[PDB]
């Protein structure tokens, strides 16, 4: 504990060129001294953590509203059940690998794209990944104990990794790039499902005066969703969206609004497909 108090003072003096490192050192000492289960470090602006070697009574770590980029210091908090890292800048989760009791992880607004470190947390029950940069969700197929998964406001178009996650009950997928719901067809245990605000972007094609674009928006059974609104006087004749474009234009689009039911869960699958055109 002398060595701990010491490490923490050195760290307190390395604030980069508005971090509340005094308050943090106070909280760390209070936590260690009382062998507390909770270490509350929210909104301190911290850009790093010192060495923390042995807080094995700590089961709840609150770090919302800091600016951490490296969570290697958390690696030995092996008894953590709840970890909150909202609005940090963490971009690799491999340092969590020995946290086998972790049940809840919040990591909103970190800008993370590489979530492969989740492979080490098969017992996770709640995972909050809203507002990140996630395109590749293939790790999530390992997280078969999740009850709650937020993936909203990411860059996800391939949801196949969720297809076997039948335990899922709360699933937030709004503000992604999802046009095909088939991966959700077996998720009949859902209560909450959010699928609004999709913005899907086709690869460019050449402009033609008679344009014919296959519809790519699919229900959970693979059937095509009839567009609601089509740009530029276009029409729909399944399976195609059609336009007459006597002059070049650089894009056309269409909007879809589809009630979905998966088990008991009811949601609106609602979004836009954009088709860029090359002259």
Numbering used by the authors: 36 to 52, 55 to 87, 93 to 321
Sentences reproduced from the published study:
InlB is a surface-associated or secreted protein that mediates uptake of the pathogen Listeria monocytogenes into normally non-phagocytic cells by specifically stimulating the receptor tyrosine kinase MET on host cells. InlB consists of an internalin domain, a B-repeat and three GW domains. The internalin domain can be subdivided into an N-terminal helical cap domain, a leucine-rich repeat domain and an immunoglobulin-like inter-repeat (IR) domain. Using this approach the biochemical properties of the cap + LRR fragment, the IR domain, the B-repeat, the GW1 module and the GW2 + GW3 pair were addressed. These experiments showed that a cap + LRR fragment is sufficient for MET binding, but that the IR domain also contacts the receptor and contributes to MET activation.
To address a potential interaction of the InlB cap domain with a binding partner from the host cell, we sought to replace the cap by a structurally unrelated domain that still initiates folding. The hybrid protein combines residues 34–87 of YopM with residues 93–321 of InlB and will be referred to as YopM-InlB. The structure of YopM-InlB at 1.5 Å resolution confirms that this designed chimeric protein is properly folded. With a melting temperature (TM) of 49,9°C (+/−0.22°C) YopM-InlB was destabilized by about 2 K with respect to InlB321 containing the native N-terminal cap (TM of 51,9°C (+/− 0.21°C)). There are major shifts between wild type InlB and the hybrid protein in residues on the concave face of LRR1. The side chains of InlB Gln80 and Asn84 form hydrogen bonds to Thr646 and His644 of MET, respectively, in the crystal structure of the InlB:MET complex. Due to their relative shift, the equivalent atoms in the corresponding residues in YopM-InlB would no longer be able to form these hydrogen bonds. Instead rearrangements extend to LRR2 and to a lesser extent to LRR3. We had not anticipated this medium range effect, which can in retrospect be explained by a slightly lower curvature in the N-terminal region of the protein due to the absence of a 310 helix in the first LRR of YopM. The reduced affinity of YopM-InlB for MET is presumably due to the exchange of the first LRR along with the cap domain resulting in spatial shifts of residues from LRR1, LRR2, and LRR3, whose side chains are involved in MET binding.
